[PDB]
Ligand binder design. Structure first.
Ligand SMILES: CO[C@@H]1O[C@H](CO)[C@@H](S[C@@H]2O[C@H](CO)[C@@H](O[C@@H]3O[C@H](CO)[C@@H](O[C@@H]4O[C@H](CO)[C@@H](N)[C@H](O)[C@H]4O)[C@H](O)[C@H]3O)[C@H](O)[C@H]2O)[C@H](O)[C@H]1O
Ligand SMILES: CO[C@@H]1O[C@H](CO)[C@@H](S[C@@H]2O[C@H](CO)[C@@H](O[C@@H]3O[C@H](CO)[C@@H](O)[C@H](O)[C@H]3O)[C@H](O)[C@H]2O)[C@H](O)[C@H]1O
Ligand SMILES: *[C@@H]1O[C@H](CO)[C@@H](O)[C@H](O)[C@H]1NC(C)=O
Length: 361
């Protein structure tokens, strides 16, 4: 029943800090941008377990640092924020963030082992409050993208592995939030009921694990929490921001046995409207800014926290048309270019986010 974001400070991980200080700052001479970059490096965004190698290295290192700070007397205690993101046939409706594992090459077994190892590590660090986002985009793709061969082919696997993860990571010091797309994906009137059906059924089939707190929205996207008028690209969706989406979604979930609490990514939501020409333009969108800083003080009963899940500056996908992971969304007129591989540092993007930051740095 506890909000896992209440009574703790959020740990800012050293990986994002290191990117900003070793890659970004040496390329930013401008005094104000340099000072702003140093400040954003300290905003506590989620750390992503995007490859298996990170489990026994980066995850352990962060948890070990938090343990040490808390043992020294940190008040409030620090909590960790981790994304689980390595399903086989990952990112099934796009090319940009295809992952290391494939269902056709022992991916299911590889993933179960990854989840088992994460469980063992979280058990060993049961003294550290841990908040998890489970597999961005996965279930949202199962709602709207069964017409995509990679997604339809992965659906049964996604379902089995999601339930596996929810049960295995159901630990006394863990809070989990399943990814649930965003207002412009699942919040469309035609998608929102089948979305609620799917998430509630997964929840029931997982045995309603205690550690499942709810859902995460807007991960790696740009939507407003709350604006007074719909951005043009949102019409005619009545759920044109995350507040509308959540207020519509929660009753439908609760009626199906899943009284989900929410966290909302605001890391790239500071400038509204954005420069997106169409709402479905997700890749390195121009006209965006760093948004509201992580906090549990949301003013909304259904929202545990505003968070930064996607770390701004880390690319959404390459704009190189010859690359294996080239996705046409990343070559569009409203995608910033040239852009490196997904997850790699995109310094010009980082600068855009600093310039447009609201609140400013
Ligand atoms: C009445 O107007 C029309 O209505 C229909 C609905 O009745 C929509 S169709 C609706 O369009 C949305 C675009 O506004 C689609 O949402 C997009 O889906 C894609 C997946 O196919 C999402 O892409 C994913 O984005 C992630 C970041 O958020 C990223 N990590 C992933 O790699 C990427 O695949 C995208 O965010 C989302 O906005 C929706 O599926 C579709 O049902 C019509 O657009 C209106 O004109
Ligand atoms: C939805 O798209 C995904 O977005 C997430 C969040 O941006 C990233 S996770 C991101 O991934 C990169 C690349 O693996 C990591 O950067 C790398 O860190 C390793 C050490 O682990 C270094 O050796 C390397 O030089 C560095 O580039 C980030 O630390 C992660 O946060 C994901 O890749 C996207 O697909
Ligand atoms: C994943 O990493 C673990 C160590 O955490 C390792 O033992 C295992 O072999 C790796 N999985 C694959 C499929 O290589």
């Amino acid at each position: 029943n506890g909000n896992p974001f209440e009574g703790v400070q959020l740990w800012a991980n050293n990986y994002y800090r290191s990117e900003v200080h070793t890659l970004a700052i040496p390329q930013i001479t401008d005094p104000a941008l340099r000072a702003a970059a140093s400040a954003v490096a300290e905003v506590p965004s989620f750390q992503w377990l995007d490859r298996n190698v990170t489990v026994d290295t980066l995850l352990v290192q962060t948890l070990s640092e938090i343990r040490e700070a808390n043992q020294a007397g940190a008040n409030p205690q620090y909590a960790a924020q981790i994304v689980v993101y390595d399903l086989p046939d990952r990112d099934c409706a796009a090319a940009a963030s295809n992952g290391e594992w494939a269902i056709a090459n022992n991916g299911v077994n590889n993933y179960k082992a990854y989840i088992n190892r994460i469980r063992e590590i979280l058990i060993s660090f049961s003294d550290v409050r841990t908040i998890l986002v489970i597999e961005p985009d996965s279930l949202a793709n199962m709602v709207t993208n069964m017409n995509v061969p990679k997604c339809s082919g992965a659906a049964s696997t996604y379902r089995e592995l999601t339930i596996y993860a929810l049960k295995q990571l159901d630990l006394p010091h863990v809070a989990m939030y399943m990814d649930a797309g965003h207002a412009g994906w699942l919040g469309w009137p035609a998608n929102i009921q089948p979305a609620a059906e799917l998430f509630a059924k997964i929840y029931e089939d997982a045995g309603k694990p205690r550690a499942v707190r709810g859902l995460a929205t807007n991960v790696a996207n740009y939507n407003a929490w709350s604006v007074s008028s719909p951005p043009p690209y949102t019409s005619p969706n009545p759920n044109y921001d995350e507040k509308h989406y959540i207020e519509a979604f929660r009753p439908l979930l609760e009626a199906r046995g899943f009284p989900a609490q929410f966290i909302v990514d605001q890391g790239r939501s500071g400038k509204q409207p954005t420069g997106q020409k169409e709402w479905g333009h997700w890749c390195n969108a121009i006209g965006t800014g760093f948004g509201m800083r992580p906090t549990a003080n949301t003013g909304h009963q259904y929202v545990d926290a505003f968070v930064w899940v996607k770390p701004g500056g880390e690319c959404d996908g390459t704009s190189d048309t010859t690359a294996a992971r080239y996705d046409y969304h990343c070559g569009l007129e409203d995608a910033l270019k040239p852009a490196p591989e997904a997850g790699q540092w995109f310094n010009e993007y980082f600068i855009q986010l600093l310039r447009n930051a609201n609140p400013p740095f």
